[PDB]
Amino acid sequence: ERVLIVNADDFGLSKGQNYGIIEACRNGVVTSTTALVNGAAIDHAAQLGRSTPELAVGMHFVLTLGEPLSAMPGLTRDGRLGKWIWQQAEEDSLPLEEIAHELACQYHRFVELFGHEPTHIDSHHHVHMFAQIYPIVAAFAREKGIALRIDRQVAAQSGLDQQAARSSAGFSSEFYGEAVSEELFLQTLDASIARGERSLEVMCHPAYVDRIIMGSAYCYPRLDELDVLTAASLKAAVADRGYRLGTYRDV
Ligand SMILES: [Zn+2]
């Protein structure tokens, strides 16, 4: 009747995150994950994905963290990606062709790593929701016949096409922080329901802690997210609300 997609971002970031996502899926409500095809532990993530058919995998398009697959002289500094892209976007100085080519390269490498088309595309730091990147990424997803994470409030603030590609009816980025709880997760569900949404994607970041995660400002809350997502109470509350646990393939 309703479909709930619970998507863990940043598959491939680190081995500890990889094991947190697998655990949140095998013993929790995580149904989906999106992978950094350039991540330090991407080959490790791909071995787990191949062994865990019950986990759907999409592509975490990334323009701000690793090294790109293709040469992007209009974007990289000392060969690396980084967070200057926000200012570069507002100065209308994005190398949009380089970006489109890197999107195609990350897609090609995704299929090599995992042996299937990604169920959908989202992005590290939500860069695919930038006004000038969104129509490129959505046209790509439409072209490939796959879905897109669509933050509908961001799209509406930026005049973007809500139908640019197939997606869930709504998306929530509100399940995060130090105060993560079962309550918080369920509040995003009940808020989606009141908006009249028949499907919802809920972002999350479960992980076991390793030295890579310890280098992030968001570290130990990932353990709390893992705890919430694997509690027996949560599956009951999801079912209680008429949700079927699902993936972007259902859209
Ligand atoms: Zn991310």
Numbering used by the authors: 1 to 251
Article sentences:
Thereafter, the purified protein was crystallized, and the 1.83 Å crystal structure was solved using the molecular replacement phasing method and refined to Rwork = 20.24 % and Rfree = 25.02 %. Two molecules (A and B) were found in the crystallographic asymmetric unit. The kpChbG crystal structure showed the typical fold of the YdjC family and contained an unbalanced α/β barrel fold consisting of eleven α-helices (α1–α11) and seven β-sheets (β1–β7). An acetate molecule and metal ion were found in the putative active site of kpChbG. Clear metal ion density coordinated by D11, H61, and H125 was detected at the putative active site of kpChbG. The metal ion was identified as Zn2+ by inductively coupled plasma mass spectrometry (ICP-MS)23 with a detected concentration of 701.7 ppb (µg/kg) in around 30 µM of ChbG protein. Residues D10 and H206 might be responsible for kpChbG deacetylation activity by working as a general base and acid, respectively, since they were also localized at the putative active site. The theoretical molecular weight of monomeric kpChbG, including the C-terminal his-tag is 30.2 kDa. Multi-angle light scattering (MALS) showed that the absolute molecular mass of kpChbG in solution was 64.9 kDa (2.1 % fitting error), which confirmed that kpChbG is a dimer in solution. Since kpChbG had the shortest α3/β3 connecting loop and the α9 helix was localized far from the α3/β3 connecting loop, the tentative active site of kpChbG showed an open conformation with a wider, deeper groove than observed in the other two homologs.
ChbG encodes a chitooligosaccharide deacetylase (CDA) which catalyzes the removal of one acetyl group from N,N’-diacetylchitobiose. ChbG is a unique COD that is conserved in bacteria to mammalian genomes.
